[PDB]
């Protein structure tokens, strides 16, 4: 309670394991008294491409299109497209942002990559100065809640896929830490599709339980050592 | 060379540094007598979202949609959307696939992540089993040609961003090696926007010059040790 949460959710099927993890997060955080908002990217048909449509009115340089410069200037001039500014409002108000998605190619599904690319623009999420520890979203918490096709064992250092931490680097460090977030420990639900009726219940309930004390948690130290060393 | 090359290119502006890099690759590979195809994903308005529009037949499970299961079936039955099969034909014929893109959030722009999520489907690019060294695209080469905002110094072990190889992992290992590609060493053009006019010219020529002898290169050992060290 006393806290706002945004859940950015990227799965096509409400009946999925991901849908159930999103729905228990809404149920538990709402029960606590928290303010909860969900960006259901597939239901929003969220646009993932970074294009000159993201700037309304006239371009800062209509001869040579530079997306990073154009969106930084549009942010400053309040001329970003309304899909982007609608998500920036949600993020500005939120104390915690939870991303709920299936792992696609050791990363986020493209529709959620497009949310990161287009919503987290210069002047909003980071700047010169203001990145990593001083990123502009500092004071906010972020959490990846990821489901995988691969088993926890495939995801060990000398397993086929390498350690989980290795694929988290670009998301936790290159994106969430960069913008100033304190990153809570990821929630990894390994291989739900090959698990029992039960077991899947256990993974959902562990997530609901964890959410009971989410505001007591300490952030991970979001460092190269955390992801790569021992 | 009697070889076919596919360049999958992700930049909005033909006059950009990335556009110069793509065009020098076409110029040099064409000069060598290679067969060259470019998939210019923004000009194509390439769809990045993985949705049930990607399958045109009867779904295997119309009550609970599972993108992986439905696209795997659809590939076997030939009922995937034609944009996906257009790209699969290009990849099937290619001996080398070059990806040319600006780094976005330590990864690929979302339009290109969509190309990976939708084009590299089960059945086509990998099977379970039939992945990493037994992936379905064995015998083919792939190369990432990436441009960055950050300087080379920023992308070292003790730099802010950590080593450049760390962010390559989900792309080289988790996607290309997974599909059975041999991965050539990445071409990383650091911080062109801050470079001098003539440093930019030097990076473009360094890539043209490397392309002269590309068919003589051996692939990297695409392992955890190469990416992260000891
Ligand atoms: C393009 C693509 C790329 C991929 N890349 C990777 C990758 O790099 N690495 C990797 O490891 N995997 C990868 N995968 C696999 C993907 O990560 C998994 O398929 C996904 O994470 C499984 O989550 P899901 O919600 O879609 O499972 P679901 O199939 O929706 O759920 C599993 C089962 O649980 C049921 N269920 C729903 N709610 C509940 C609940 N209340 N309690 C109990 N059961 C419930 C479902 O109906 C279903 O039978 C990829 C898949 C695709 C399509
Ligand atoms: C959403 C987003 C996320 C980003 N995330 C990251 C990230 O995680 N890490 C990171 O390091 N960076 C990041 N960046 C920055 C991005 O990677 C760089 O801006 C991009 O790599 C620079 O490439 P470009 O082709 O767009 O440069 P350009 O701005 O086109 O190139 C700079 C100059 O090169 C010139 N040029 C073009 N052709 C030639 C030629 N033949 N000879 C000489 N000069 C030429 C152009 O005219 C221009 O003046 C991000 C940017 C965005 C928009
Ligand atoms: C059934 O789907 C999957 C199951 C398990 C996987 O890794 C253990 C993958 C990977 C790595 C890529 C992918 O595209 N699909 C996968
Ligand atoms: C021009 O924009 C940028 C320049 C340099 C960068 O790193 C040195 C970044 C990073 C790391 C993330 C990002 O989103 N944008 C960047
Ligand atoms: C770590 O962040 C950064 C690294 C390197 C950069 O250029 C060399 C930038 C620029 C140009 C703008 C910016 O906002 N952030 C940057
Ligand atoms: Zn970090
Ligand atoms: Zn590898």
Q: SS3 letters for B3-47?
A: CEEEEEECCCCCCCHHHHHHHHHHHHHHHCCCEEEEEEHHHHCCC
**CATH number of A95's domain:** 3.40.50.360
Phi, psi (rounded to 5 degrees) for A3? -140, 145
Q: How far apart are CA A42 and CA A37, in angstroms?
A: 15
- E strand spans, chain A: 4-9, 35-40, 96-102, 141-148, 182-183, 187-190
Domain of A86?
A: 1-230
> Determination technique for this PDB entry?
X-ray
Separation of CA A60 and ligand 3 centre (Å): 43
Interface contact A48-B12, CB threshold 8 A: no
Cα B148 to averaged position of ligand 4 atoms, centre (Å): 7
Residues of chain B in contact with residue A166, where contact means CB-CB under 8 angstroms, are: 169, 224, 227-228
Contact A48 B114 (CB under 8 A): yes
- CA distances A129 to A122, A178, A179, B7, B192, Å, are 10, 12, 11, 36, 20
The total of structural domains in chain B comes to: 1
Q: What is the b/e burial string over A173-205, where b = at least 16 CB atoms within 10 angstroms of the residue's CB? A: bbbbbbbbbbbbebbbbbbbeebeeeebeebbe
Q: Is A55 helix (H, G, I), strand (E, B) or coil?
A: strand
Residue of A49, A120, A170 lying closest to B107 (CB–CB): A170
Whole-number Cα distances in Å, A22 to A115, A146, A214, B107: 17, 11, 15, 25
Cβ <8 Å between B113 and A120:
no
β-strand partners of B138: none
The residue of chain A nearest to residue B176, with distances taken between CA atoms, is A105
């Amino acid at each position: 309670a006393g806290k706002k949460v945004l859940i950015v959710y990227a799965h096509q099927e409400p009946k999925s394991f991901n849908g159930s993890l999103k729905n228990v997060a809404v149920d538990e955080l709402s029960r606590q008294g928290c303010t909860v908002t969900v960006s259901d990217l597939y239901a929003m048909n969220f646009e993932p491409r970074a294009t000159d449509k993201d700037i309304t009115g006239t371009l800062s340089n209509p001869e040579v299109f530079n997306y990073g410069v154009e969106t930084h200037e549009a942010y400053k001039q309040r001329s970003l497209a309304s899909d982007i500014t609608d998500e920036q409002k949600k993020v500005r108000e939120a104390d915690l942002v939870i991303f709920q998605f299936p792992l696609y190619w050791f990363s986020v599904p493209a529709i959620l990559k497009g949310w990161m690319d287009r919503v987290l623009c210069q002047g909003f999420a980071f700047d010169i100065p203001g990145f990593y520890d001083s990123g502009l979203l500092q004071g906010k918490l972020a959490l990846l809640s990821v489901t995988t096709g691969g088993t926890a064992e495939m995801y060990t250092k000398t397993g086929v896929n390498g350690d989980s931490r290795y694929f988290l680097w670009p998301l936790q460090h290159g994106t969430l830490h960069f913008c100033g977030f304190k990153v809570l420990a990821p929630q990894i639900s390994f291989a739900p599709e090959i698990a029992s009726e039960e077991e899947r219940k256990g993974m959902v309930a562990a997530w609901s339980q964890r959410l009971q004390t989410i505001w007591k948690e300490e952030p991970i130290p979001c460092t190269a050592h955390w992801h790569f060393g021992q």
